Amino acid sequence: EFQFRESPAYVNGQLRPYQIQGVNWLVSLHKNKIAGILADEMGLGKTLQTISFLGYLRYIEKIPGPFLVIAPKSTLNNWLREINRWTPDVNAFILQGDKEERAELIQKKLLGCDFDVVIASYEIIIREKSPLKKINWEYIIIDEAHRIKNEESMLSQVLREFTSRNRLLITGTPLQNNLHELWALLNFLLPDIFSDAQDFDDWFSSQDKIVKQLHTVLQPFLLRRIKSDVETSLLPKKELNLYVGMSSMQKKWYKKILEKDKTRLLNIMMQLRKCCNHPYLFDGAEPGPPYTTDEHLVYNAAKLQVLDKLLKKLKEEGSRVLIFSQMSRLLDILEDYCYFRNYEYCRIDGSTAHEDRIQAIDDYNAPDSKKFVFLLTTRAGGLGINLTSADVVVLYDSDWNPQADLQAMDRAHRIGQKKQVKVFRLVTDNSVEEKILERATQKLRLDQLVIQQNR
Template sequence: MGLGKTIQSIAFLQEVYNVGIRGPFLVIAPLSTITNWEREFNTWTEMNSIVYHGSLASRQMIQQYEMYCKDSRGRLIPGAYKFDALITTFEMILSDCPELREIEWRCVIIDEAHRLKNRNCKLLDSLKHMDLEHKVLLTGTPLQNTVEELFSLLHFLEPSQFPSEAEFLKDFGDLKTEEQVQKLQAILKPMMLRRLKEDVEKNLAPKQETIIEVELTNIQKKYYRAILEKNFSFLSKGAGHTNMPNLLNTMMELRKCCNHPYLINGAEEKILAEFRESCHHHVPHDFHLQAMVRSAGKLVLIDKLLPKLKAGGHKVLIFSQMVRCLDILEDYLIQKRYLYERIDGRVRGNLRQAAIDRFSKPDSDRFVFLLCTRAGGLGINLTAADTCIIFDSDWNPQNDLQAQARCHRIGQSKAVKVYRLITRNSYEREMFDKASLKLGLDKAVLQSM
């Protein structure tokens, strides 16, 4: 990740273009990265690239003036296009745009292609209805949970070579022997171009990850116990089809409690009332800030860590799974008067790139960048930061690796420190230990290739 997949793909399309295959080419990428794709096309090639995204009205405007060639009478000329490359998002493909289905694409490049890991996802279904001659998948994390997901990518690339999932899983489903691993590697080798950071950049600063175990505060312990007691009947039944939603809900409530009790419905008002009572009429001027920090072990740690990082001239990325958790962190940063930027699923595409540029410019005064792991963890470059705090871990460890790679990538001149906050003796710790086992699959199959 951060090895220049974007530039390499654009160089590949330019080379194809130079030998006489004039497109049209299609690039499908996450919303956060499409502005960067357009920027790189304009920097490195002479090709005419257009971004196809936005409301129906703006897409109709693009169709009218930027997509199709017309004759002197204003009629469309079949197969003739004004653009060479069209950049769009996964959402556009999912929303089933017939105008994109009608075009015979000479090559498609799918960025962050692990989006296709689920055989039954709607995105794969939409892509099957498109005319795609040559396919290129870009991903830093092709193997995330199971070998099944790898089959999904291989079947999309070469359906004739990989027709049957059952057969593939019979050969490689459990990967118990070295022979199986070697056989799978032999299949992957001709289809996969893989580079590591150390192959490309010998002087890349090291990355050091520190797992910090945080204690639950007394308030958190009270709510944690209450969640377990309230859901005791579900927990004692164990996992089954009918019980699964209840268990997932309990799991989510425990995760919320580990992050910050304010995430639990109705807790904030109760905590503030109790804190006000404990002050005995001497209510401090930063009453809300103190109550917020003291309520959660992770925020107590952040409150101690950030001033030291600021004094050391560091810039910080903070990743969380939960948008409401980012709201609490944003509230904290405002009250502490730390300047920050933020990207989550609600931030629109053009505003995302503007936030990245403001944070990254050399004289920037922004200290913290708040990011949602899924929305801000893919494809963006934030090498201005040298510290990454993972506020809460993902069930899929590759998503956390993707997040860390926002700042630990080529162009990073400082050593990168990653702090992963995990609540001691809690469900969160158990979840992290189980998720870490998944990295073993990636290590066995890919790292040794």
């Protein structure tokens, strides 16, 4: 069939050969009338192949049509700018903003069919579902596919109601927790083909009798390209675990929690995690009032006490830092710390407004990049955004799900890095953090050691 030998003429820029192979894969799927998962690793231009394939469907098979692209909120500007850079000839816009503006946009453009590509976030989709359900979509494109890993999630349900000629999924981390997630994704891709949960489960029941069958069943539905066997031009990542103890305040509060010491303690896990991260997250442990930010912050927190030394050092080495955390409040603590330390942060979080997010990213990726450290959270700003300017990623606290950390560390070690990436994960000795690290390791091995080793 149409094998699409060389780089597209209509697509600007030159794409590397494996990108052409992926585009060919997509075209094959489109003609065969099957939909698959572009599960390529983090960092490679998955957006670029997607745009190329849309350019195919517009300029070869001549179907501009309605195109729906769903993505995390932070990456909507990224998609818009990229589609305006590679094929600046398609009608594309972001369906975001106030509900008044959203309804206005619907009435003008969405109901006027004056569009080709629509970019929307999950919340808008689940919100603006009635008008979108009135369009016979050709392709529905979901970035960050592991978001629908639960089939009862109302995003999953709503997506299972749109009129779609065909579907297509992107995710850098396809397998998250167990097998059932894959069935969840595929039931969205090919509902008729699978339509079976227990049959899928018992066809394998979690040697060679299964894992080989595992590969065989999904060989045509998935495509992965590891960065080691495909790019290689990239210096590899350097990870590190900085084992630390606890300070006096930390130790005291840790026991106080342990022997149950009028405040509500129901999930002991999160209380211990707060303790290990920073005891000031507990109310009142900070001396005062008056509340002053001079220096009592750093020394009574083993995490931050080590952090100050390491950050200052790297400042003399003159590199750039990314800080990921699980908690917005700890992020506030860190921000106050830099305010004391006279650094130039560029904090992003789940409460940050859209254009503020755009402005922050553009600030940190500026030429000469006035900013030093950039404050993040693993969920909100830990997907898709392209902070290649920095070179040192610091995971303040580990996550219960390793792939959420893989995405975070790969937000800097992606194409066009041209540096050495050093990832400094902080752990606390003799604490639950060790346990969460262990469980994350088992969940991650259940993944890498089995499914995607050949890929």
